[PDB]
């Protein structure tokens, strides 16, 4: 299952999300109609390069084909990167540059970042 390696960047869907609740996962909400995104497009690709190398998965979400995910996180500003470590989500606070990224991972700088506690998807009480 998913043995082969297809594109360093994984494509998370309204169902794959679950996976994000396992191990480390780097997500980045981008948009095709958004200019800034076009600039990150490359910055992200270059990152995913050493991603798996530093023991960190990298995925990408589409705010045009995935209307659900967009809400599951309530993304208003873009682009926007989210660090998911064993369920613990942490908003990215950097220039979003290949270099920076590395540290954020290797230097686990994420530790010095306040996570988010607004995820209750799954066990619904109704």
From Swiss-Prot:
Stretches assigned to the Thioredoxin domain: 8-110
Function statement: Thiredoxin domain-containing protein that participates in various redox reactions through the reversible oxidation of its active center dithiol to a disulfide and catalyze dithiol-disulfide exchange reactions. Acts as a key inhibitor of the alternative triglyceride biosynthesis pathway by inhibiting the activity of TMEM68/DIESL at the endoplasmic reticulum, thereby restricting accumulation of triacylglycerol. The alternative triglyceride biosynthesis pathway mediates formation of triacylglycerol from diacylglycerol and membrane phospholipids.
Extracellular compartment spans: 8-120
More details: Mediates reduction of intermolecular disulfide bonds between chain A and B of Ricin toxin (Ricin A chain and Ricin B chain, respectively), thereby releasing and activating Ricin A chain.
Parent-record interval covered: 30 to 142 of 280
Oligomer status and interactors: Interacts with ATP2A2.
Disulfide bridge partners, by residue number: 34-37
Tissues of expression: Ubiquitous. Highly expressed in kidney, liver, placenta and lung.
Cellular location(s): Endoplasmic reticulum membrane; Mitochondrion membrane; Secreted
PTM statement from Swiss-Prot or TrEMBL: Palmitoylated; palmitoylation is required for localization to mitochondria-associated endoplasmic reticulum membrane (MAM).
Active site: 34, 37
Gene name tied to this protein: TMX1
Name of this chain's protein: Thioredoxin-related transmembrane protein 1
Effect of residue 37 to S: Loss of reductase activity and ability to inhibit TMEM68/DIESL
